[PDB]
Design an enzyme around this catalytic site. Structure first.
Site, PDB file in Angstrom:
ATOM      1  N   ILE A  30       6.451   4.282 -20.950  1.00 16.89           N
ATOM      2  CA  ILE A  30       5.154   3.662 -21.171  1.00 16.89           C
ATOM      3  C   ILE A  30       4.706   2.967 -19.865  1.00 16.89           C
ATOM      4  O   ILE A  30       5.517   2.361 -19.174  1.00 16.89           O
ATOM      5  CB  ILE A  30       5.160   2.700 -22.385  1.00 16.89           C
ATOM      6  CG1 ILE A  30       5.632   3.406 -23.658  1.00 16.89           C
ATOM      7  CG2 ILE A  30       3.767   2.120 -22.599  1.00 16.89           C
ATOM      8  CD1 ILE A  30       5.788   2.510 -24.830  1.00 16.89           C
ATOM      9  N   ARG A  32       3.399   4.174 -16.828  1.00 19.21           N
ATOM     10  CA  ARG A  32       3.735   4.840 -15.564  1.00 19.21           C
ATOM     11  C   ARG A  32       4.811   4.123 -14.689  1.00 19.21           C
ATOM     12  O   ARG A  32       4.685   4.081 -13.461  1.00 19.21           O
ATOM     13  CB  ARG A  32       2.421   5.069 -14.773  1.00 19.21           C
ATOM     14  CG  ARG A  32       1.517   6.181 -15.341  1.00 19.21           C
ATOM     15  CD  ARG A  32       0.610   5.712 -16.470  1.00 19.21           C
ATOM     16  NE  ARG A  32      -0.133   6.809 -17.094  1.00 19.21           N
ATOM     17  CZ  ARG A  32       0.211   7.410 -18.231  1.00 19.21           C
ATOM     18  NH1 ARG A  32       1.306   7.038 -18.883  1.00 19.21           N
ATOM     19  NH2 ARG A  32      -0.537   8.388 -18.724  1.00 19.21           N
ATOM     20  N   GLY A  33       5.849   3.579 -15.334  1.00 18.41           N
ATOM     21  CA  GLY A  33       6.950   2.888 -14.663  1.00 18.41           C
ATOM     22  C   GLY A  33       6.736   1.422 -14.308  1.00 18.41           C
ATOM     23  O   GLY A  33       7.710   0.727 -13.981  1.00 18.41           O
ATOM     24  N   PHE A  35       6.360  -1.222 -16.025  1.00 19.75           N
ATOM     25  CA  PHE A  35       7.081  -2.169 -16.875  1.00 19.75           C
ATOM     26  C   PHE A  35       8.589  -1.873 -16.980  1.00 19.75           C
ATOM     27  O   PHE A  35       9.258  -2.366 -17.896  1.00 19.75           O
ATOM     28  CB  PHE A  35       6.440  -2.237 -18.276  1.00 19.75           C
ATOM     29  CG  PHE A  35       5.039  -2.796 -18.355  1.00 19.75           C
ATOM     30  CD1 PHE A  35       3.935  -1.980 -18.159  1.00 19.75           C
ATOM     31  CD2 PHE A  35       4.825  -4.124 -18.702  1.00 19.75           C
ATOM     32  CE1 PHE A  35       2.643  -2.489 -18.270  1.00 19.75           C
ATOM     33  CE2 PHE A  35       3.531  -4.631 -18.824  1.00 19.75           C
ATOM     34  CZ  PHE A  35       2.448  -3.811 -18.609  1.00 19.75           C
ATOM     35  N   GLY A  36       9.109  -1.092 -16.037  1.00 22.97           N
ATOM     36  CA  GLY A  36      10.524  -0.729 -16.001  1.00 22.97           C
ATOM     37  C   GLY A  36      10.892   0.400 -16.941  1.00 22.97           C
ATOM     38  O   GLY A  36      10.094   1.311 -17.158  1.00 22.97           O
ATOM     39  N   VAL A  38      10.862   1.370 -20.096  1.00 16.76           N
ATOM     40  CA  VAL A  38      10.282   1.163 -21.420  1.00 16.76           C
ATOM     41  C   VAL A  38       9.727   2.487 -21.922  1.00 16.76           C
ATOM     42  O   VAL A  38       8.903   3.113 -21.265  1.00 16.76           O
ATOM     43  CB  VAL A  38       9.302  -0.039 -21.517  1.00 16.76           C
ATOM     44  CG1 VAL A  38       8.069   0.140 -20.640  1.00 16.76           C
ATOM     45  CG2 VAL A  38       8.911  -0.316 -22.959  1.00 16.76           C
ATOM     46  N   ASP A 147       6.160 -19.274 -18.049  1.00 13.00           N
ATOM     47  CA  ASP A 147       5.550 -18.240 -17.200  1.00 13.00           C
ATOM     48  C   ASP A 147       4.296 -17.621 -17.830  1.00 13.00           C
ATOM     49  O   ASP A 147       4.163 -16.412 -17.920  1.00 13.00           O
ATOM     50  CB  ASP A 147       6.583 -17.159 -16.767  1.00 13.00           C
ATOM     51  CG  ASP A 147       6.176 -16.287 -15.570  1.00 13.00           C
ATOM     52  OD1 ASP A 147       5.169 -16.617 -14.903  1.00 13.00           O
ATOM     53  OD2 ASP A 147       6.854 -15.261 -15.320  1.00 13.00           O
ATOM     54  N   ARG A 151      -1.148 -11.695 -16.718  1.00  9.29           N
ATOM     55  CA  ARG A 151      -0.265 -10.519 -16.615  1.00  9.29           C
ATOM     56  C   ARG A 151       0.798 -10.528 -17.746  1.00  9.29           C
ATOM     57  O   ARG A 151       1.308  -9.467 -18.120  1.00  9.29           O
ATOM     58  CB  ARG A 151       0.407 -10.442 -15.209  1.00  9.29           C
ATOM     59  CG  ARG A 151       1.586 -11.423 -15.027  1.00  9.29           C
ATOM     60  CD  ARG A 151       2.057 -11.648 -13.599  1.00  9.29           C
ATOM     61  NE  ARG A 151       2.729 -12.952 -13.458  1.00  9.29           N
ATOM     62  CZ  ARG A 151       2.167 -14.050 -12.946  1.00  9.29           C
ATOM     63  NH1 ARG A 151       0.915 -14.022 -12.505  1.00  9.29           N
ATOM     64  NH2 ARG A 151       2.853 -15.182 -12.873  1.00  9.29           N
ATOM     65  N   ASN A 152       1.107 -11.720 -18.299  1.00 11.62           N
ATOM     66  CA  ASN A 152       2.162 -11.892 -19.289  1.00 11.62           C
ATOM     67  C   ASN A 152       1.693 -11.913 -20.725  1.00 11.62           C
ATOM     68  O   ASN A 152       2.444 -12.345 -21.601  1.00 11.62           O
ATOM     69  CB  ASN A 152       2.967 -13.133 -18.941  1.00 11.62           C
ATOM     70  CG  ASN A 152       3.762 -12.902 -17.677  1.00 11.62           C
ATOM     71  OD1 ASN A 152       4.188 -11.789 -17.388  1.00 11.62           O
ATOM     72  ND2 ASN A 152       3.964 -13.924 -16.887  1.00 11.62           N
ATOM     73  N   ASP A 165       6.335 -11.964 -22.464  1.00 12.61           N
ATOM     74  CA  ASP A 165       7.184 -12.426 -21.369  1.00 12.61           C
ATOM     75  C   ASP A 165       8.050 -13.648 -21.732  1.00 12.61           C
ATOM     76  O   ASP A 165       8.222 -14.561 -20.927  1.00 12.61           O
ATOM     77  CB  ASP A 165       6.362 -12.663 -20.098  1.00 12.61           C
ATOM     78  CG  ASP A 165       7.201 -12.928 -18.859  1.00 12.61           C
ATOM     79  OD1 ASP A 165       8.129 -12.121 -18.579  1.00 12.61           O
ATOM     80  OD2 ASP A 165       6.940 -13.941 -18.174  1.00 12.61           O
TER      81      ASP A 165
HETATM   82  F1  SWK Z   1       8.251  -3.421 -21.417  1.00 10.61           F
HETATM   83  C1  SWK Z   1       8.185  -4.670 -21.923  1.00 10.61           C
HETATM   84  C2  SWK Z   1       9.340  -5.411 -21.985  1.00 10.61           C
HETATM   85  C3  SWK Z   1       9.271  -6.692 -22.501  1.00 10.61           C
HETATM   86  C4  SWK Z   1       8.061  -7.198 -22.940  1.00 10.61           C
HETATM   87  C5  SWK Z   1       6.912  -6.429 -22.866  1.00 10.61           C
HETATM   88  C6  SWK Z   1       6.954  -5.137 -22.349  1.00 10.61           C
HETATM   89  C7  SWK Z   1       5.686  -4.320 -22.276  1.00 10.61           C
HETATM   90  C8  SWK Z   1       5.252  -3.663 -23.563  1.00 10.61           C
HETATM   91  C9  SWK Z   1       5.705  -3.867 -24.836  1.00 10.61           C
HETATM   92  N1  SWK Z   1       5.029  -3.053 -25.714  1.00 10.61           N
HETATM   93  C10 SWK Z   1       4.132  -2.309 -25.005  1.00 10.61           C
HETATM   94  N2  SWK Z   1       3.297  -1.404 -25.515  1.00 10.61           N
HETATM   95  C11 SWK Z   1       2.505  -0.802 -24.608  1.00 10.61           C
HETATM   96  C12 SWK Z   1       2.522  -1.061 -23.236  1.00 10.61           C
HETATM   97  C13 SWK Z   1       1.611  -0.371 -22.298  1.00 10.61           C
HETATM   98  C14 SWK Z   1       1.708  -0.250 -20.904  1.00 10.61           C
HETATM   99  N3  SWK Z   1       0.696   0.435 -20.397  1.00 10.61           N
HETATM  100  N4  SWK Z   1      -0.065   0.754 -21.474  1.00 10.61           N
HETATM  101  C15 SWK Z   1      -1.317   1.529 -21.365  1.00 10.61           C
HETATM  102  C16 SWK Z   1      -1.151   2.992 -20.971  1.00 10.61           C
HETATM  103  C17 SWK Z   1      -2.502   3.679 -20.872  1.00 10.61           C
HETATM  104  N5  SWK Z   1      -3.382   2.958 -19.937  1.00 10.61           N
HETATM  105  C18 SWK Z   1      -3.629   1.576 -20.400  1.00 10.61           C
HETATM  106  C19 SWK Z   1      -2.323   0.804 -20.474  1.00 10.61           C
HETATM  107  C20 SWK Z   1       0.451   0.286 -22.623  1.00 10.61           C
HETATM  108  C21 SWK Z   1       3.411  -2.017 -22.754  1.00 10.61           C
HETATM  109  C22 SWK Z   1       4.238  -2.661 -23.659  1.00 10.61           C
END
Ligand code: SWK
Length: 281
Positions: A30, A32-33, A35-36, A38, A147, A151-152, A165
């Site tokens: 999820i 494109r990398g 968020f590590g 995930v 924090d 962004r969080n 976060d």
């Molecule tokens: F990895 C974590 C680790 C700990 C806390 C929080 C997180 C993050 C996260 C959690 N649940 C998510 N569900 C979706 C997305 C996400 C990222 N990018 N997108 C979209 C892609 C299309 N383009 C627009 C953004 C959605 C990120 C998270």
């Protein structure tokens, strides 16, 4: 896993997602990398409903000791539930997994920065209000975030803002490579390295400023080393162009040098909802 304390294993049962209840798609990341590690996942509830979820592999955990502590941060975060706080769906005990709800619109900062999106001033204040409600809940539980920044925070498909976060959802932006948020910190946190709900109120003030500028960086001309002296001189972030005057007064009270003089998150919810309610939508 059999090496773990039995009464501790019994305590974490209500947090644990069994392997037959979760489908992890390790082939699809999820965001494109950014968020590590995930991954998209599918969680099956007790009625067999399919829940789209974000699955993080907790690679930092190896030994029995670290597993046991992670089980505790799991038990504690599982008790935190609020519409404006990112919930922990559960954990999987290969490395331990953290299961979180899927947030369609990703982080609040990136959503507001995206040229294609056009939130109104009221929509922006609404996001601030949502954060304030998430923080009011955390503060009611005596939980210090440490924090808070745009962004969080995450945005779901209903445009509901979730404070993230923290707990097992911490180190959100930890990326792997092959080769201190001082601009959001309260003046006393920069001087003492201690954090309180009153220091979170300061950071919320900064996040409000981020919301009203559509994610502009705070103090772009001031070094992180120079922030302390800059704040001691009584200099503060300036009123954003499209920010209403009563809301800027709310941001200013958040940055009062005397921690006890800043609003409580309960007061911020009261003041922001009253401001939000003066806008048609
Ligand atoms: F990895 C974590 C680790 C700990 C806390 C929080 C997180 C993050 C996260 C959690 N649940 C998510 N569900 C979706 C997305 C996400 C990222 N990018 N997108 C979209 C892609 C299309 N383009 C627009 C953004 C959605 C990120 C998270």
């Amino acid at each position: 896993l059999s090496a773990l304390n039995p009464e501790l294993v019994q305590a974490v049962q209500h947090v644990v997602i069994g392997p037959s209840s979760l489908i992890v798609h390790f082939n699809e990341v999820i965001g494109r990398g950014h968020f590590g590690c995930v991954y998209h996942g599918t969680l099956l509830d007790n009625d067999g409903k399919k829940i789209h979820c974000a699955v993080k592999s907790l690679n930092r955990i190896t030994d029995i000791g670290e597993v046991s502590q992670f089980l505790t941060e799991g038990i504690i975060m599982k008790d935190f539930s609020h519409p404006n706080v990112l919930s922990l769906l559960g954990i999987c005990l290969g490395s331990p997994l953290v299961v979180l709800p899927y947030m369609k619109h990703g982080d609040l900062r990136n959503f507001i920065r995206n040229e294609t999106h056009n939130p109104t001033v009221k929509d922006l204040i609404g996001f601030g209000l949502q954060v304030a409600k998430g923080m009011k809940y955390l503060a009611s539980k005596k939980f210090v975030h440490r924090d808070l920044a745009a962004r969080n925070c995450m945005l779901d498909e209903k445009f509901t803002v979730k404070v993230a976060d923290f707990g097992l959802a911490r180190d959100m932006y930890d990326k792997e490579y092959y080769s201190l948020p001082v601009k959001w910190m309260a003046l006393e946190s920069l001087q003492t390295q201690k954090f309180t709900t009153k220091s979170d109120v300061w950071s919320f003030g900064v996040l409000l400023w981020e919301l009203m500028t559509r994610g502009a960086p705070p103090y772009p001309d001031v070094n992180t080393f120079d922030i302390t002296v800059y704040l001691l001189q009584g200099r503060r972030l300036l009123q954003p162009e499209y920010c209403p005057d009563p809301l800027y007064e709310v941001m200013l009270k958040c940055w009062h040098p005397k921690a006890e003089m800043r609003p409580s998150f309960s007061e911020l919810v009261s003041r922001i909802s009253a401001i939000f309610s003066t806008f048609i939508g």
